[PDB]
Design a protein around this ligand. Sequence first.
Ligand SMILES: O=C(Nc1cccc(-c2ccoc2)c1)C(=O)Nc1ccc(Cl)cc1C(=O)O
Length: 370
Amino acid sequence: HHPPSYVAHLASDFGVRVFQQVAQASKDRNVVFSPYGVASVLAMLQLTTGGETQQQIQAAMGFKIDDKGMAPALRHLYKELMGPWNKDEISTTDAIFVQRDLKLVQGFMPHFFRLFRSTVKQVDFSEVERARFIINDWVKTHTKGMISHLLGTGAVDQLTRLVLVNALYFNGQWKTPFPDSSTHRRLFHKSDGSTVSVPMMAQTNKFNYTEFTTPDGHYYDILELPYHGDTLSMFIAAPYEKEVPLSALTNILSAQLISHWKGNMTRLPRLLVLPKFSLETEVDLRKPLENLGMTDMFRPFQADFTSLSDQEPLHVALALQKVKIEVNESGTVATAVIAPEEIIIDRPFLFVVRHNPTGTVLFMGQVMEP
Ligand SMILES: O=C(Nc1cccc(-c2ccoc2)c1)C(=O)Nc1ccc(Cl)cc1C(=O)O
C-alpha cells in the first residue's frame, strides 16, 4: 500500500501517467522525467484557468487546487521533500511567466501567493532577448546553476504571452556508495541487438529485491537502492529476459504498482552490477498533456485563462520540463566486499526515485543506452 499522504499519491499518479505518454512517444531513447514536478506546476496552473480548460486539468489530475486543505497539503509535501538538508544533491524550480502588461484579475496575484508562497512572474515578451534571458536565468539561479538553459526558450517570441517551466536536478549520495575500485567496463545490450561497452559500477550488499510478472507473464527484477538520508531510494526495474522490451514494464507502471514493489521486497545478498549514467531531458509537455485530455489550454481563443486575465486571446505558448539526473558511485562527493548471486543490469531498464515516507515519485526514467 501507499503511505498515507493523499496529495503525494495524487501528484505521483498524475505525473506517472504523464511520463508514460513521454516514454511511449520515445520508444527506444533515454528519458528522464519528474512526475512530482509536472504535477506541482500544473497544480499551480489550475489557479489561472476557468471553464472547460479548468475542467480538463482537474479531471486529468484528479483534484481541484482550490479544495479545502489541498494547497496547504501540497505546501507541506514540498517542505517535507525539499526541507531536509542534502549535499547539493537535489534542486527544483517551477515558474509561470505572463506578459507584463496583461491586465490581471483583481486579487489573483495575492491569492496565488497565499496558496503557493510563490509568485506568477511578469515579463515583457516584446523584448524577446530579455524575456528569453529572464526565463533561463530564473532556472539557472534556482537550480544552483546545474540547469542554465532551456532550448525551448528558442520558441519565445514577441507573440508569447504565457509560459510555464519546471526544472529539476538530482545526483544523490547512496547510503552505501559503490566502491570506486569496482567500476569497470562491460557490454550493454541495446534494444536493437547491438552492444556497447560502458562503465558499470558494482557492489555486493543486502539489497531489497523482488520479482514481479507482467500481465503477459514476463518476469522482471526490481531492486531498491537507498540514498543516504534513509528517506529516498532509487528503484531499478528490468525484465529478466533480454528479448522482452522495456515497454512491457513502462506500459503497466503506476504509483500503486511501485508501492506494491516496495511492499513485497525482502533483503537478499547479491552482487549488483549497474551502469553509471548522466541523463538530461527537456520535454515540451503539450502532446503528453493533450493525450491526457488537456487540449484547450494550448489553443488560442479556446483556452480559458480567465481566472488570471480577461484579455483575449490567452493560451499557453510554451510548457517545458527539463530534468538532469546523475547516477554515479557516491553522488556529489568522493571499500569492496570480496561468490553470491549476481544481478547484472546490462539491458534497458527503468528507474524510479521515490520519497519513501510519502510515496512521492520524484523522478522516473528509462535508460535505453547509458
Ligand atoms: O511578483 C510579481 N508580480 C506581482 C504583481 C502584482 C501583485 C503581486 C503580488 C504578490 C503577492 O501579492 C501581490 C505580484 C512578479 O512579476 N515577480 C517576478 C517577475 C519576474 C521574475 Cl524573473 C521574478 C519575479 C518574482 O516574483 O520573483
